[PDB]
């Protein structure tokens, strides 16, 4: 490994993902693929439905913040979306890192690399609200360790 | 919870629902993203379509009550 886990340069479409193995709090980082198409949302790597709707909530928040973020005016309908977590599906309470998918697809759609040393996890609302996380402890351990 | 989750401030786009799971009824914060486009029922949250048509009866009532609520 690189020592600080921030020697990664800032990256389009990839952020550091605080998530939980049953082994524990881990950097299950985020992998996306945003290419033009039908606007379809593939989940790649056994990612479950709660991650699918989390991606929908992130998608619709971007829809609410399109020219806010300089996005194309039609992106959800012609840019196919393919996303990964190294864990297949999260055995925990949903993904607990909906904003991590949001951040990665934001960096992907901006064509502008988001930073590293991202110590983050949390649940987007389609209303646009970062839901509180259950089990802050091991997530922030996965940050700090 | 805060001093009172009922005393949480008024919310745009969503409302305090009423449930009964057999182990206990809950608030149902039914959240809706009014996303632009042309009309696409992008329902989610393991949604059964009877709630979809409930929302559609709501939708056509809003169509009936566009100037009751200043809607376009």
Q: What is the DSSP string of B19-30?
A: --BTTB--EEE-
**Are A1 and A80 a contacting pair, CB within 8 Å?**
no
**Are A19 and A64 a contacting pair, CB within 8 Å?**
no
B25: Cα within 13 Å, side-chain hemisphere: 5
B60: Cα within 13 Å, side-chain hemisphere: 5
Q: Point out the residue among A49, A64, A125 whose CB comes nearest to the CB of B35.
A: A64
Is A139 annotated as catalytic? yes
What chain B residue is nearest to A63 in terms of C-alpha separation? B35
Dihedral of the alpha carbons of B52, B54, B56, B60, in degrees to the nearest 10: -170
Resolution in A: 4.4
- Quote the CA–CA distance of A100 and A66 in Å, as a whole number: 18
Decide if B21 touches A, using CB distance below 8 A: no
Cβ contact A127–B31 (<8 Å): yes
Please indicate the experimental technique that yielded this structure. cryo-EM
φ, ψ for residue A76, nearest 5 deg: -75, -10
Question: What per-residue string of b and e applies to A76-112 under the rule 16 or more CB within 10 Å gives b?
Answer: beebebbbbbebeebebebbbbbbbbbbbbbbbbeee
Calculate ∠ Cα A63-A14-A43, nearest 5°.
Answer: 65
């Amino acid at each position: 490994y690189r020592p600080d886990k921030a020697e990664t340069e800032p990256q389009v479409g990839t952020a550091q993902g605080l998530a939980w193995t049953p082994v524990g709090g881990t950097l299950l980082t985020i992998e996306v693929a945003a290419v033009p198409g039908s606007g379809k949302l593939s989940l790649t790597g056994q990612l479950g439905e709660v991650m699918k709707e989390s991606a929908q909530a992130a998608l619709t928040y971007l829809r609410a913040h399109t020219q806010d973020y300089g996005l194309p005016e039609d992106f959800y309908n012609k840019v196919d979306l393919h996303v990964h977590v190294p864990d297949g599906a999260t055995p925990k309470d949903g993904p607990s890192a909906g904003i991590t998918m949001a951040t990665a697809i934001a960096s992907a759609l901006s064509r502008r690399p988001a930073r590293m040393d991202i110590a983050m996890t949390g649940e987007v609302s389609l209303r646009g609200k970062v839901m509180p996380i259950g089990g802050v402890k091991e997530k922030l351990l996965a940050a700090h360790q």
